[PDB]
Design a protein around this nucleic acid. Structure first.
Length: 131
RNA sequence: GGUUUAGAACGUCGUGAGACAGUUCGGUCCCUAUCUGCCGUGGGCGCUGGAGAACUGAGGGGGGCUGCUCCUAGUACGAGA
């Protein structure tokens, strides 16, 4: 049976999402294919950058009861991602994404249906963001 | 209202008058503020020619309480709660 993976609780101070990928591949014996990627966590959760759509959905704090306003920032090197997220966090997104590409997987529909890779989504079910 | 006067009764002590830091019902609380003090409010004279305004500010006084909710965030902390 195929497995989607959702990394919940990005409102909280969490572990390194890199390390989180290791624990999922190593201990669950299944490949990880990131679809989105968190930008900051805890008090610094700013949203997720979508790897395949190449855009950035911006998290707003405490709209967990309804659906928040979908607020996108288009480019991964769009200088508005720097403005909206702070250029510091913006580069760490860029850095991590570099490492991610050298140590992860492209989502393949065939291997997902074979139960050999999981599409990993990062989000927060409480903030109603990522769902 | 209590309690300390005078009336009356109970228990109680005493032959008794009376008595009890025992109880019970009743039972006159004056003052026109001279001074100090304090709240206000004027008059005088001063401040150096006499006036009409507007000021500066040495000082002085007043004020100074706090609940609950929401954002942060059900975040940090926490196995959870």
């Amino acid at each position: 049976t195929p497995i989607l993976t959702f990394m919940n609780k990005l409102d909280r101070d969490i572990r390194d999402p890199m390390e989180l990928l290791d624990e999922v591949e190593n201990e669950l014996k299944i490949g990880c294919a990131p679809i989105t990627w968190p930008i900051g966590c805890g008090k610094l959760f700013k949203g997720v950058y979508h790897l395949y759509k190449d855009e950035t959905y911006l998290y707003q704090s405490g709209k967990g009861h309804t659906i928040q306003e979908v607020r996108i920032v288009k480019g991964l090197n769009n200088p508005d991602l720097d403005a909206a997220v702070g250029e510091d966090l913006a580069q760490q997104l860029r850095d991590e994404l570099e490492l991610v590409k050298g140590a992860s997987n492209e989502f393949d529909k065939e291997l997902f249906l074979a139960g050999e890779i999981t599409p990993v989504f990062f989000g927060t079910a409480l903030g109603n963001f990522g769902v």
